[model samples]
Target: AMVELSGTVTFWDTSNEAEKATYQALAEGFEKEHPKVDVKYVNVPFGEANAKFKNAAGGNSGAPDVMRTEVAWVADFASIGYLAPLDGTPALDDGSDHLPQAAASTRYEGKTYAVPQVIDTLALFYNKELLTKAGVEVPGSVAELKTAAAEITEKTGATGLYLRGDDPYWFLPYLYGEGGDLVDEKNKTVTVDDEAGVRAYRVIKDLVDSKAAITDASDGWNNMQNAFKSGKVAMMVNGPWAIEDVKAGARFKDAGNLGVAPVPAGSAGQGSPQGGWNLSVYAGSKNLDASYAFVKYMSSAKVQQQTTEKLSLLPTRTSVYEVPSVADNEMVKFFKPAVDKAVERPWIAEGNALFEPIRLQMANVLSGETSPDEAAANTGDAYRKLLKDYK
Candidate 1:
């Protein structure tokens, strides 16, 4: 077992500046565990990883043995036979322990092509200073979010929440909470007008009517940001992209005062959309086994737990969340588990186009011009019109 795996296992890590330092030790740790394989830890800028990896993998030259790949990119990479299968191999170690939804995006054509490294999802980003002043904890359900708004305003002068109305992506967590979506691509069904969808729309509209939430039909993005950052709003729902910019506000001067929690549940339950990185081996690697071994070691429950401690990235393993260290980490306690349950968007040719209908309907619904039921119905109709042969 010692020195049996020899050769330089070149690895590319797609991590941001905040998370890069932690990735170094984890990538290099594979060397110590496996005895002789030297891990070439290459940190690739996240946005560039896909394009760069494609060239290397497609050309079969300058490709690292392994890469930290985005979940959405896994299937595309695998479809072209660029990724090696981890299924039925030791590389798939304890694979059943992976979160069901997080694991949902790791496979392609029935083969496990990647191991989930970290998951990202929407969370209720609340101003802790404001919430504490208002005498409310982070809302655990949509009802709580609604209730806290007035109290927060009375005590802190901040609005209860800023609901993003311009962007359809912002509506997903709420839609998922009510157990509805724009369409079901895999099954070829249009369900946005289904029973749950109307309920989802009604809940959001009720929040605005109750004066617990503030929204804009357009200009919502900039307005939401200004409201929350300047202490005009106490809460909002967002994912990874907002954290750093969120902390830039005067309210978070302590930095410790920005609170994150799972997107509140609806009658259905809590869920957000999932986007995470995975450890995958390049198919053309000269050191195939060593490369496979790298992915296995890099994505194990122990490594994921350690990752949480080092960089605050959520673990992808179910049992890993139970660990004291992972659960105790403030952010991990909330968003990580939510990210595990985060739904995957349908990967269809209409992927980008799917949002337009929701955008149009979202504005009308938030504007008080369209009723919730009709908005849902309109979205379903628009979706069906855009999708050929869709039921």
Candidate 2:
């Protein structure tokens, strides 16, 4: 009798070619392991990820058996009892072999709900040739980065940094750096208007106004990354996926020098928002053990590494980072430390309430609709509502 097990998996659209390849490669391995199991890998639009899952849960019985969820959303879904409890799922092996953060991100309250697939965090990507050409040293702190930005802008007349001004997800790292946080820990207040919040906002505002920088707030992830690919900017804030795209770009033919480093430390310290995906079983799925096995097989470090070559995902497991392949690759090597030190967004019961407010504040500050302090004040109010509702 064949172990008759079948399920569908989902992920957001690949940011680049390398990422798509990685997913395909992993799916092939998964098929090899369970010949009787039919696996479907769907690449949903990034914007549709949340909605699709919600709709599916709301009676789309054909909904995926296993699906990708954001690191930040784990808690929200878990609190509503929308996910299958992964605790003691046999496949987890008590998480003795996984990275602490990967396991931690997928756990809510006291139960493990999912398993991490790839790890992600923002890293500083500097144009080595630009730094050398401008006679400036690479920066270590927010202040030094500004200095370098100024010098590069003045000397080379190139954009000092390529930034996504309109993107909300990009702000959390900066907010963390400035000693500000999205949600106040003590009183559970929104502190986006805090002193540190203003500090973080001011830096980015000034950089864009520098005139030496490219004003590309309208550009999305692809545009910002292509800036580095075309050698138009001195540096950029990106993740491992960006590095892979840069390498694959034609400019890399000269082995155009690139340096990947940590995000500049802010007044508080250097920090990045925790970013990754989780593989979860729907709360309604009857084949729980089957779903668990799929996660175990797909998330294994060996499989993760092999599959990522085609998809080139950043492995969430610490052991995956220690492998010689990542260590030897200059771009990937810098990812380890950054991932090790990342700060996860709050996993509160009403986290979405907070994210929406923070996103508004970020856009207003960028567009000059309001001062950072004013934006923070407004966002903080949103946090208070969540606190009230959750309480």
Candidate 3:
């Protein structure tokens, strides 16, 4: 006989009231179905949840039965035995139904540790009216993007593009497009100090140099979103998460012309960084069956579809793409192509170590503190040092 199982889950807060309510509704539905189980959901600050979960799990006390975690950090926690492996469970048995890149985030050393709930990729978001007014068509390549950006700024007096310079995630698309990678985990090599990396850095440096781009080093993540929302900038590199804010803004309402495209191609062809959150069972959970049940429920197509509808988050399940709700979604149509072509960031145990140095190097180049060659060399040096300690 199955014993009654119950526990708590910690989740990151959503951007608005409706999305929060949607989550509650899902929890309520799950509770109704599993009458013998009592699962509680708590919302933690997004920026703080990772550390909180890590500390709680590391100490083997006070951790929730399950938690929401970023895709990038899943391997780190799982490798430490802080998360339960889902390999033999139905929750992760057949990954064929999920997005390849997002599904890959759930596994560490061929065992499953997490399940992706939502997936996302970066893309070029442009103001259609601004582009048309400036006589600049949608940019198809990096060079064309730069030219269009310069043209938009010169004609409309709005900043051409706004890029978050302090985030390594934001830099991956460009680096991948130009055939640069921070580390090659398969071969155990550092690959950031090559011609491709230098060219990628030069692209950004020259954009700033030409006054065709504004760097978000000082104002942080929200600055670019706010700038684009307010029409202070004509283009931005952002993800599906920004759609809600963009839709609610005056620029979107006035022109009814928000446009989305895959991140423009470069020398190596187009690419975008893929990332999102995952639901995982805590390794120390008292209710193993109930915990797995909750994880599977949250990752279900029904829940993922509702999340996509209420939150505008991209779904991980390939089947969800064909549903009317998702297929009819305008933003979904624009995002799917990019998401399909997106690549997962490094998922090795030392993955978190790579972020800071890349951000520092990007900021240095953006601020004219160093040349592209110097920034690449410095970033490579930092990467090598981190790799040394890991090995």
Candidate 4:
């Protein structure tokens, strides 16, 4: 007997047009090919995913058969045994491949719980014309990044770069380059206060202090985009979302001046924390066999290949990426090197709690509320305590 799979909506879907279109396309594709099965699109409102899921889980009413989750939330859901374990499942085992890190984030206590839908990483987006006019080389290392950003600002009167002043996303690349692991591998302790982590904070401060960065009194990421688009900034450490802005920025496009590079290496070598969504079965789904099939279909190389073509998402599987059709897309082409080096965010049930505070600490250090050393020490103690009750 075939099953009808009802999909759940997520806050991410509501806010991202590409993601919404991608999911809708997947649902349509599933329905067209599988006559006996039906894929229903159920919209869940933004900022209400957690509460809505909680209510559905509690009542077993209006629950989705299949769902999407942020990589960071995988541990919490899987740890509580609120998700179906997927290893050795017929649909996934036979269907397709997952990026190593995406699979890692969805695995809890060493069991697979979800499959990756897409993968993401930040790149060093620079304005080539700005660099040429400043007579500085494109940054290939942290030292070069700092020097290039500063020179572009000093000589051209443009903000050399833009970074998130109050957002954690801005701090992730710096933290990765400094040989600092957000969570200690051996001890399972949060290392947000490691000396290298402190150095990471100092690096961000150095940018602001050197006049290489200009902070807008507005939302962080959007402001960075606006700064670049308006020709007020010469470069930004950004993700795919900023690609259009670069193309539209006259100084960047008119002169063919845009560049994307992997985050510069620090003592730790290249590291950019991976970001993306995962597909999973509902905790109490009565339709899991069909649910798995939906995931399998969505993540299959064919569908993934189609996804890469129709949308700008990076292929989550190495095999899918190897397909000439996918590899040839100019946008996806620029990301291969960066995605090859990407690593997952620390996958722990308490990781969200851990990251939020760490972001605040970075903001504190930058805002003069805490010294880097003191911020690191406090963050370490707080994060360790947060994880104390967790296994």
The prediction achieving the highest lDDT against the true structure is 1
TM-score of 4: 0.90
lDDT of 1 by residue, 1-391 (tens): 5448889899998888878888898889887767788888999998898889999878869998998877767876787778888888778876778877668778775678888888887878889888988898888888878788889989977889998889887888888889877677568899989988898888888888888988887687788888889988999888766777887887877878887777888888677877778888898889988887888888898899898888888778888889998889866755764575588866444555777888888788888899989989998898888888799
Clash count for each candidate, listed in order shown: 0, 7, 0, 0
Give the whole-model CA lDDT for all candidates, comma-separated: 0.82, 0.70, 0.81, 0.73
TM-score of 3: 0.90
lDDT of 2 at 348: 68
Higher-scoring candidate on TM-score, 2 or 4: 4
Clashing pairs in 4: none
Residue 280 error for model 2, in Å? 0.8
Higher-ranked by lDDT: 2 or 3? 3
Model 3 is weakest, by summed lDDT over 10 consecutive residues, at: 8-17
Candidate 1 regions with alpha-carbon error over 4 angstroms: 1-3, 35-38, 132-138, 182-186, 198-210, 216-225, 240-248, 254-258, 334-341, 344-390
**lDDT for position 237 in model 2:** 81
Candidate 2 lDDT over residue span 100-144, tens digit each: 667778878777888887777888888887788889987877678
Model 3 lDDT vs. the true structure?
0.81
Per-residue error for 127 in candidate 1, Å, reads: 3.3
> Candidate 1 — worst ten consecutive residues by lDDT sum?
345-354
The 10-residue segment of model 2 with minimum total lDDT is 9-18
For model 2, what is the alpha-carbon lDDT of residue 155?
80
- Relative to the true structure, candidate 1 reaches a TM of 0.82
TM-score of each: 0.82, 0.83, 0.90, 0.90
